[PDB]
Design a protein around this ligand. Structure first.
Ligand SMILES: [Mg+2]
Ligand SMILES: [Mg+2]
Ligand SMILES: [Mg+2]
Ligand SMILES: [Mg+2]
Ligand SMILES: [Mg+2]
Ligand SMILES: [Mg+2]
Ligand SMILES: [Mg+2]
Ligand SMILES: [Mg+2]
Ligand SMILES: [Mg+2]
Ligand SMILES: [Mg+2]
Ligand SMILES: [Mg+2]
Ligand SMILES: [Mg+2]
Ligand SMILES: [Mg+2]
Ligand SMILES: [Mg+2]
Ligand SMILES: [Mg+2]
Ligand SMILES: [Mg+2]
Ligand SMILES: [Mg+2]
Ligand SMILES: [Mg+2]
Ligand SMILES: [Mg+2]
Ligand SMILES: [Mg+2]
Ligand SMILES: [Mg+2]
Ligand SMILES: [Mg+2]
Ligand SMILES: [Mg+2]
Ligand SMILES: [Mg+2]
Ligand SMILES: [Mg+2]
Ligand SMILES: [Mg+2]
Ligand SMILES: [Mg+2]
Ligand SMILES: [Mg+2]
Ligand SMILES: [Mg+2]
Ligand SMILES: [Mg+2]
Ligand SMILES: [Mg+2]
Ligand SMILES: [Mg+2]
Ligand SMILES: [Mg+2]
Ligand SMILES: [Mg+2]
Ligand SMILES: [Mg+2]
Ligand SMILES: [Mg+2]
Ligand SMILES: [Mg+2]
Ligand SMILES: [Mg+2]
Ligand SMILES: [Mg+2]
Ligand SMILES: [Mg+2]
Ligand SMILES: [Mg+2]
Ligand SMILES: [Mg+2]
Ligand SMILES: [Mg+2]
Ligand SMILES: [Mg+2]
Ligand SMILES: [Mg+2]
Ligand SMILES: [Mg+2]
Ligand SMILES: [Mg+2]
Ligand SMILES: [Mg+2]
Ligand SMILES: [Mg+2]
Ligand SMILES: [Mg+2]
Ligand SMILES: [Mg+2]
Ligand SMILES: [Mg+2]
Ligand SMILES: [Mg+2]
Ligand SMILES: [Mg+2]
Ligand SMILES: [Mg+2]
Ligand SMILES: [Mg+2]
Ligand SMILES: [Mg+2]
Ligand SMILES: [Mg+2]
Ligand SMILES: [Mg+2]
Ligand SMILES: [Mg+2]
Ligand SMILES: [Mg+2]
Ligand SMILES: [Mg+2]
Ligand SMILES: [Mg+2]
Ligand SMILES: [Mg+2]
Ligand SMILES: [Mg+2]
Ligand SMILES: [Mg+2]
Ligand SMILES: [Mg+2]
Ligand SMILES: [Mg+2]
Ligand SMILES: [Mg+2]
Ligand SMILES: [Mg+2]
Ligand SMILES: [Mg+2]
Ligand SMILES: [Mg+2]
Ligand SMILES: [Mg+2]
Ligand SMILES: [Mg+2]
Ligand SMILES: [Mg+2]
Ligand SMILES: [Mg+2]
Ligand SMILES: [Mg+2]
Ligand SMILES: [Mg+2]
Ligand SMILES: [Mg+2]
Ligand SMILES: [Mg+2]
Ligand SMILES: [Mg+2]
Ligand SMILES: [Mg+2]
Ligand SMILES: [Mg+2]
Ligand SMILES: [Mg+2]
Ligand SMILES: [Mg+2]
Ligand SMILES: [Mg+2]
Ligand SMILES: [Mg+2]
Ligand SMILES: [Mg+2]
Ligand SMILES: [Mg+2]
Ligand SMILES: [Mg+2]
Ligand SMILES: [Mg+2]
Ligand SMILES: [Mg+2]
Ligand SMILES: [Mg+2]
Ligand SMILES: [Mg+2]
Ligand SMILES: [Mg+2]
Ligand SMILES: [Mg+2]
Ligand SMILES: [Mg+2]
Ligand SMILES: [Mg+2]
Ligand SMILES: [Mg+2]
Ligand SMILES: [Mg+2]
Ligand SMILES: [Mg+2]
Ligand SMILES: [Mg+2]
Ligand SMILES: [Mg+2]
Ligand SMILES: [Mg+2]
Ligand SMILES: [Mg+2]
Ligand SMILES: [Mg+2]
Ligand SMILES: [Mg+2]
Ligand SMILES: [Mg+2]
Ligand SMILES: [Mg+2]
Ligand SMILES: [Mg+2]
Ligand SMILES: [Mg+2]
Ligand SMILES: [Mg+2]
Ligand SMILES: [Mg+2]
Ligand SMILES: [Mg+2]
Ligand SMILES: [Mg+2]
Ligand SMILES: [Mg+2]
Ligand SMILES: [Mg+2]
Ligand SMILES: [Mg+2]
Ligand SMILES: [Mg+2]
Ligand SMILES: [Mg+2]
Ligand SMILES: [Mg+2]
Ligand SMILES: [Mg+2]
Ligand SMILES: [Mg+2]
Ligand SMILES: [Mg+2]
Ligand SMILES: [Mg+2]
Ligand SMILES: [Mg+2]
Ligand SMILES: [Mg+2]
Ligand SMILES: [Mg+2]
Ligand SMILES: [Mg+2]
Ligand SMILES: [Mg+2]
Ligand SMILES: [Mg+2]
Ligand SMILES: [Mg+2]
Ligand SMILES: [Mg+2]
Ligand SMILES: [Mg+2]
Ligand SMILES: [Mg+2]
Ligand SMILES: [Mg+2]
Ligand SMILES: [Mg+2]
Ligand SMILES: [Mg+2]
Ligand SMILES: [Mg+2]
Ligand SMILES: [Mg+2]
Ligand SMILES: [Mg+2]
Ligand SMILES: [Mg+2]
Ligand SMILES: [Mg+2]
Ligand SMILES: [Mg+2]
Ligand SMILES: [Mg+2]
Ligand SMILES: [Mg+2]
Ligand SMILES: [Mg+2]
Ligand SMILES: [Mg+2]
Ligand SMILES: [Mg+2]
Ligand SMILES: [Mg+2]
Ligand SMILES: [Mg+2]
Ligand SMILES: [Mg+2]
Ligand SMILES: [Mg+2]
Ligand SMILES: [Mg+2]
Ligand SMILES: [Mg+2]
Ligand SMILES: [Mg+2]
Ligand SMILES: [Mg+2]
Ligand SMILES: [Mg+2]
Ligand SMILES: [Mg+2]
Ligand SMILES: [Mg+2]
Ligand SMILES: [Mg+2]
Ligand SMILES: [Mg+2]
Ligand SMILES: [Mg+2]
Ligand SMILES: [Mg+2]
Ligand SMILES: [Mg+2]
Ligand SMILES: [Mg+2]
Ligand SMILES: [Mg+2]
Ligand SMILES: [Mg+2]
Ligand SMILES: [Mg+2]
Ligand SMILES: [Mg+2]
Ligand SMILES: [Mg+2]
Ligand SMILES: [Mg+2]
Ligand SMILES: [Mg+2]
Ligand SMILES: [Mg+2]
Ligand SMILES: [Mg+2]
Ligand SMILES: [Mg+2]
Ligand SMILES: [Mg+2]
Ligand SMILES: [Mg+2]
Ligand SMILES: [Mg+2]
Ligand SMILES: [Mg+2]
Ligand SMILES: [Mg+2]
Ligand SMILES: [Mg+2]
Ligand SMILES: [Mg+2]
Ligand SMILES: [Mg+2]
Ligand SMILES: [Mg+2]
Ligand SMILES: [Mg+2]
Ligand SMILES: [Mg+2]
Ligand SMILES: [Mg+2]
Ligand SMILES: [Mg+2]
Ligand SMILES: [Mg+2]
Ligand SMILES: [Mg+2]
Ligand SMILES: [Mg+2]
Ligand SMILES: [Mg+2]
Ligand SMILES: [Mg+2]
Ligand SMILES: [Mg+2]
Ligand SMILES: [Mg+2]
Ligand SMILES: [Mg+2]
Ligand SMILES: [Mg+2]
Ligand SMILES: [Mg+2]
Ligand SMILES: [Mg+2]
Ligand SMILES: [Mg+2]
Ligand SMILES: [Mg+2]
Ligand SMILES: [Mg+2]
Ligand SMILES: [Mg+2]
Ligand SMILES: [Mg+2]
Lengths: 124, 138
RNA sequence: CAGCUAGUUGGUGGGGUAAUGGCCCACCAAGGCGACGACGGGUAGCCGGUCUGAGAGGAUGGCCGGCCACAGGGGCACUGAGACACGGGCCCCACUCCUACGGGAGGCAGCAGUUAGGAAUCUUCCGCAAUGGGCGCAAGCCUGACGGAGCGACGCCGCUUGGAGGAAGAAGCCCUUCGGGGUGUAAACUCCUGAACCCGGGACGAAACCCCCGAGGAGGGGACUGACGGUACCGGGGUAAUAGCGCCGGCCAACUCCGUGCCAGCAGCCGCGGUAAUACGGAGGGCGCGAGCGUUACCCGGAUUCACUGGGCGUAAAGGGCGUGUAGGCGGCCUGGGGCGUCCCAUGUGAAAGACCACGGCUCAACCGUGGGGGAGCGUGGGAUACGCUCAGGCUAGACGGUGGGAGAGGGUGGUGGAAUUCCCGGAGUAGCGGUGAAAUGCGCAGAUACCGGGAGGAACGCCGAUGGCGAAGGCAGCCACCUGGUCCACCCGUGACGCUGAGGCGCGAAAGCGUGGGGAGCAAACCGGAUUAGAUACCCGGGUAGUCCACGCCCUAAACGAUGCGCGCUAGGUCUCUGGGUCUCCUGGGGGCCGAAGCUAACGCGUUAAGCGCGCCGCCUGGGGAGUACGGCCGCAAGGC
RNA sequence: CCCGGGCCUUGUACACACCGCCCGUCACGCCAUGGGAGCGGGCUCUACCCGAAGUCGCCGGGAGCCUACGGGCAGGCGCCGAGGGUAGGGCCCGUGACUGGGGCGAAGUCGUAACAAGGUAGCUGUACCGGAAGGUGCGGCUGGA
RNA sequence: AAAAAUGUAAAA
RNA sequence: AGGAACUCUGCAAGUUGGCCCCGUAACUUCGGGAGAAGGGGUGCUCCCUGGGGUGAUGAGCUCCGGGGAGCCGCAGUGAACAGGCUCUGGCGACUGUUUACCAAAAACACAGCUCUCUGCGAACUCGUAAGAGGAGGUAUAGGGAGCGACGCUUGCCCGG
């Protein structure tokens, strides 16, 4: 543009919205797992993904993905939301924390125990 | 009606030099003289003098160039590598004494209009004054 | 969010306060504010500072420091130098508790501590010993301010889990061309040190108020007190003494084996997995980092992806459809005063904490003390005048005007000419015409087609006519006249910077469409029929309405296309065309088209008719889809448009 | 001319490359969203009615107390006044039978409109019409020859 | 100036 | 005391009622919706005061009004005259007309739309006729038919 154009109009501020509606951007939100079902993946994949809708205590209701090999969440489990979408499942924009509350960790796991919530074992 | 005589003037030089002309004219003016005055003081023009274009006081700016070049496309060197205006009639650029720019680490010059005359990028600094940054040359 | 305002704006007089003031009252006058964004809505305490960043900028205001505001919600005034008063008071509201039912108590957004909520945030500690505060002649009293401890890898910093040696190289584990390779000096083991732990000693922080001579002062000499603490620190005695997390396809540093078989599962981006995966899981090994590693979240960065620095708009997102002009923005050559912008000096200022540099303190650091530096901006005084600005005088190069000529499908009105189509009348004449790729529907023995004469009506204008001209765009063609805009060249005659651009606004704006009235030849959505086709709401054929035309009014869109906004300046030229000037195998001004110097460009391609070099102004773009939709607002009869 | 092949040229939205690609209705599932008889909820504006405490103003009289008799205090009325109440508008949020279109999907159905004269050049404003893409009309643009 | 429709879904 | 529980139906009755001022939505053909709604005032006494008519420019007379102080009752248009309101659907646009004497409507009439006849000695109507109306009008006129303001719009079928 010109100088006057800037003097009047001005550069429009960027401003970007969040990829995750988790309230106060709180690290993790707590909720009670309502539905615990397995949905089929999207375009390039097919491997029945263990997902679970969780009616937050913050009044919300979203779907979260359970990592690891299996789990133990029923119709009334409590759990935390990690926050992190899955490009293979339409709508799932929240991971589900492991080892926290009713949500147990992963059995047998060795490497990367951190993410999959598994207190280090003992070989001896 | 034009706007900044200097703007189009510096352009006369630019377009001319690009095609390697002997010299070019431009409506006579006080400030333009100062421009060439310094544009010769540091050595970028062979010189200048008021001429006539049908009863119209102009200014013949005699251009300076470099030695002939060997190899593909014998392009004669450009004395005035680059000259562009800074303080536009749109944006009047006023700089302070300890703000005056250093055109290409000294290799260049900043023709500006001080509050006590017209000086180079260094000359203005020496005298210890600031002014409107007309343009730079290198 | 586009208009807002009755104490509203101002005035006179008065009330009230420490004091000015619609702060408040009575009376009077209509003013006050706003696209430089009033009014509304949303959000939020502000700064010093902090975070990031090459800087400019962006983000931010936790701790400490300064100002502000509140003390359950909400109002009030009393006391006082000061309050609308956290630990005061009165009243209403919600809530809690007592109650002899008449009444009464109470406020942690003070330290600590509950409970709720949440992802998540500490002991109901010690002392007035130090510092500061209140009262007091003093002694001394109180002090959850503070000094200090306690819990939490929450952060930054220092340290420990050891050091030297030690096999051509244990054991196990992994790999293997079965030779060997790897873990790996790693360990075992030898030797030295010695955190932890033990014993003894054991602070600074403290001096002063208090006593004495002098004069109850100045000066000088004497005396009391330590929460932390029996802590840190000093000396001696002293045991090898916790290691974890992420990654290993590319980005990105780290490769192999088994298992699995589009399962399980990974995923930040691209992607991997469907029998041999360095990408899922385990292992061996390696890479990084270390009392940490890693995830999620949020901020700056990369992002020159809102571009001042520092973008761009022919086809990639983007020139407004075109014109007129309001604000605003910009400003030709010379001379003069002013000195507003701006430039320089001096000065007040910019407090402390911080950041930076320097020295120093705590064993170092973190932390901290001390000193030095210049700081943007603003206040005052002085100075300069170059360009911007401003008043003033002069010029003619921009723009305008005069005189004189020219070209043109520029526009509007009235009139008018031939050709041809259809129709009707009359003449003559007979079996077919028409139509397609083919054919049919259709038209004709009631006399068609073809041809001849007369008439009626509507619409469009052949040849001239083009690589043409004209206008702002849309757009404009037979012919004559009227009225009328724009444009060009010559004479350099007049004016004397009068200019460029243009948010909003005003006007124009193809075609289709709507409204009242008029006209209707041909053509022609829709619609009817024939044929093709699986189907054929279509391509072709036959018939046919609105519309196409006139008037007046509205609609306002388009591939409105050069897909290229407007204006002034500079930058080879060759070629032909429209038009104008001139003693003219040629020169000069305006317009149209091709090819190309330099140059720009992602390429194509542009290139004096720029997409070149440069200034001024508006318009506009910031991934695709969603969607030119939805809502709101405005316009319209509607369709629909902005 | 049919099938197959070669060199040059033109076009292209095709690139294990015309068995390529590709459009729209309809059908099933999913996600978000617009309108919707309404309902519910917050904030806000105006008019009026009631009106605590309290300052201020008046009275303090047929009534109380105080008094250096001039006055004071109590008390009463009034103004304003928190909030409460009634009626009516503005904005925002949630919700709602049904409905509109949109996005999404290894597979369906119906055609083939688009890219090659895509086998009627295509695109386009507007109009009309049809299961659907789309056809046709009036004009316009080449991004057609 | 050339009557004639259509090929779903797994690797460079 | 309650407040539509009555009943086919708030039928009837009751509520509201006049003026003054405040204030007033959806929607809309911008005219309206409007008296929308909802709400305040209304008497008497004293005092100040603005304007018009007549008339001399004022005295009296007379019309409409402004401000302040106060008095009495349960009640101030103190009696009589004197809308109850709102939301939503159907039909008909609307004012109008009708079954004198059980129906006032959604019926008819209407403006405006369309079709059709009629060229004047008009068509049509009454009359046997003369004649008259039409009309001392002339296709922007007249007769007949249907539809019924306005907006959007009106599809295919001549075989009978
Ligand atoms: Mg399970
Ligand atoms: Mg449990
Ligand atoms: Mg040369
Ligand atoms: Mg010279
Ligand atoms: Mg007042
Ligand atoms: Mg006063
Ligand atoms: Mg006063
Ligand atoms: Mg006070
Ligand atoms: Mg006043
Ligand atoms: Mg007044
Ligand atoms: Mg603003
Ligand atoms: Mg708020
Ligand atoms: Mg706030
Ligand atoms: Mg940067
Ligand atoms: Mg920094
Ligand atoms: Mg805090
Ligand atoms: Mg509280
Ligand atoms: Mg309170
Ligand atoms: Mg309060
Ligand atoms: Mg006090
Ligand atoms: Mg307290
Ligand atoms: Mg207090
Ligand atoms: Mg008891
Ligand atoms: Mg008792
Ligand atoms: Mg109390
Ligand atoms: Mg109390
Ligand atoms: Mg109380
Ligand atoms: Mg308490
Ligand atoms: Mg507390
Ligand atoms: Mg504390
Ligand atoms: Mg606590
Ligand atoms: Mg507790
Ligand atoms: Mg809890
Ligand atoms: Mg005592
Ligand atoms: Mg060693
Ligand atoms: Mg000692
Ligand atoms: Mg001492
Ligand atoms: Mg002493
Ligand atoms: Mg003392
Ligand atoms: Mg003494
Ligand atoms: Mg003494
Ligand atoms: Mg003393
Ligand atoms: Mg000890
Ligand atoms: Mg020791
Ligand atoms: Mg020791
Ligand atoms: Mg030893
Ligand atoms: Mg050892
Ligand atoms: Mg060891
Ligand atoms: Mg040892
Ligand atoms: Mg890593
Ligand atoms: Mg790996
Ligand atoms: Mg791995
Ligand atoms: Mg690598
Ligand atoms: Mg498996
Ligand atoms: Mg992994
Ligand atoms: Mg992908
Ligand atoms: Mg394998
Ligand atoms: Mg494989
Ligand atoms: Mg692996
Ligand atoms: Mg990987
Ligand atoms: Mg991986
Ligand atoms: Mg490992
Ligand atoms: Mg960022
Ligand atoms: Mg940036
Ligand atoms: Mg961007
Ligand atoms: Mg960009
Ligand atoms: Mg971005
Ligand atoms: Mg860009
Ligand atoms: Mg474009
Ligand atoms: Mg244009
Ligand atoms: Mg102006
Ligand atoms: Mg001057
Ligand atoms: Mg002077
Ligand atoms: Mg001077
Ligand atoms: Mg300055
Ligand atoms: Mg200074
Ligand atoms: Mg300063
Ligand atoms: Mg200083
Ligand atoms: Mg500063
Ligand atoms: Mg200082
Ligand atoms: Mg400072
Ligand atoms: Mg230094
Ligand atoms: Mg040092
Ligand atoms: Mg030091
Ligand atoms: Mg140091
Ligand atoms: Mg040191
Ligand atoms: Mg040191
Ligand atoms: Mg310091
Ligand atoms: Mg300092
Ligand atoms: Mg120094
Ligand atoms: Mg300054
Ligand atoms: Mg003339
Ligand atoms: Mg003409
Ligand atoms: Mg004509
Ligand atoms: Mg025959
Ligand atoms: Mg026939
Ligand atoms: Mg026959
Ligand atoms: Mg044209
Ligand atoms: Mg004319
Ligand atoms: Mg003319
Ligand atoms: Mg001439
Ligand atoms: Mg002359
Ligand atoms: Mg002249
Ligand atoms: Mg002249
Ligand atoms: Mg003159
Ligand atoms: Mg203009
Ligand atoms: Mg206007
Ligand atoms: Mg107009
Ligand atoms: Mg038309
Ligand atoms: Mg019409
Ligand atoms: Mg129509
Ligand atoms: Mg016809
Ligand atoms: Mg028919
Ligand atoms: Mg047909
Ligand atoms: Mg036809
Ligand atoms: Mg129609
Ligand atoms: Mg015509
Ligand atoms: Mg138009
Ligand atoms: Mg456009
Ligand atoms: Mg112009
Ligand atoms: Mg010529
Ligand atoms: Mg000339
Ligand atoms: Mg030319
Ligand atoms: Mg070219
Ligand atoms: Mg070149
Ligand atoms: Mg290039
Ligand atoms: Mg090229
Ligand atoms: Mg050229
Ligand atoms: Mg030229
Ligand atoms: Mg040329
Ligand atoms: Mg988008
Ligand atoms: Mg549109
Ligand atoms: Mg709308
Ligand atoms: Mg538009
Ligand atoms: Mg050959
Ligand atoms: Mg050959
Ligand atoms: Mg070849
Ligand atoms: Mg592709
Ligand atoms: Mg195909
Ligand atoms: Mg393919
Ligand atoms: Mg909704
Ligand atoms: Mg509601
Ligand atoms: Mg509010
Ligand atoms: Mg008493
Ligand atoms: Mg009161
Ligand atoms: Mg009151
Ligand atoms: Mg009140
Ligand atoms: Mg109130
Ligand atoms: Mg209300
Ligand atoms: Mg309301
Ligand atoms: Mg709603
Ligand atoms: Mg729906
Ligand atoms: Mg329906
Ligand atoms: Mg679509
Ligand atoms: Mg599908
Ligand atoms: Mg199927
Ligand atoms: Mg499909
Ligand atoms: Mg087509
Ligand atoms: Mg084509
Ligand atoms: Mg094409
Ligand atoms: Mg079309
Ligand atoms: Mg055109
Ligand atoms: Mg060709
Ligand atoms: Mg042909
Ligand atoms: Mg099919
Ligand atoms: Mg395929
Ligand atoms: Mg009763
Ligand atoms: Mg009822
Ligand atoms: Mg009934
Ligand atoms: Mg009665
Ligand atoms: Mg009344
Ligand atoms: Mg009455
Ligand atoms: Mg009323
Ligand atoms: Mg009503
Ligand atoms: Mg009323
Ligand atoms: Mg009333
Ligand atoms: Mg009279
Ligand atoms: Mg009289
Ligand atoms: Mg009364
Ligand atoms: Mg209905
Ligand atoms: Mg009716
Ligand atoms: Mg009626
Ligand atoms: Mg009607
Ligand atoms: Mg009707
Ligand atoms: Mg009658
Ligand atoms: Mg009658
Ligand atoms: Mg009657
Ligand atoms: Mg009757
Ligand atoms: Mg009756
Ligand atoms: Mg009636
Ligand atoms: Mg009737
Ligand atoms: Mg009727
Ligand atoms: Mg009608
Ligand atoms: Mg008869
Ligand atoms: Mg007659
Ligand atoms: Mg007659
Ligand atoms: Mg007559
Ligand atoms: Mg008629
Ligand atoms: Mg009817
Ligand atoms: Mg009807
Ligand atoms: Mg119709
Ligand atoms: Mg019909
Ligand atoms: Mg039909
Ligand atoms: Mg018939
Ligand atoms: Mg027939």
């Amino acid at each position: 543009p010109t100088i006057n154009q800037l003097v009047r109009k001005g550069r429009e501020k960027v401003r970007k919205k969040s990829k995750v509606p988790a309230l106060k951007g709180a690290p993790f939100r707590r909720g009670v797992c309502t539905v615990v079902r397995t949905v089929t993946p999207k375009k390039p994949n097919s491997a029945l993904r263990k997902v679970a809708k969780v009616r937050l205590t913050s009044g919300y209701e979203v779907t979260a993905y359970i990592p690891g090999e299996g789990h133990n969440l029923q119709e009334h489990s409590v759990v935390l939301i990690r926050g992190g979408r899955v490009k293979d499942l339409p709508g799932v924009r929240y991971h589900i924390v492991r080892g926290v509350y009713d949500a147990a960790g992963v059995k047998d796991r060795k490497k990367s125990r951190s993410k999959y919530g598994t207190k280090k074992p003992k070989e001896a | 009606m034009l706007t900044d005589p200097i703007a189009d003037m510096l352009t006369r030089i630019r377009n001319a030099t690009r095609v390697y002309k002997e010299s070019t004219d431009v409506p006579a003016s006080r400030f333009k003289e100062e421009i060439l005055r310094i544009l010769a003081r540091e050595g970028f023009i062979k010189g200048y003098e008021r001429v006539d274009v049908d009863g119209k006081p102009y200014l013949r700016v005699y251009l300076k160039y470099g030695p002939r070049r060997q190899g593909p496309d014998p392009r004669p060197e450009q004395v005035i590598h680059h000259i562009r205006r800074i303080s536009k009639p749109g944006r009047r650029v006023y700089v302070g004494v300890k703000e005056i720019p250093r055109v290409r680490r000294g290799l260049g010059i900043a023709i500006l209009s001080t509050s006590k005359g017209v000086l180079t990028d260094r000359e203005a600094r020496k005298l210890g004054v600031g002014g409107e940054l007309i343009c730079e040359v290198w």
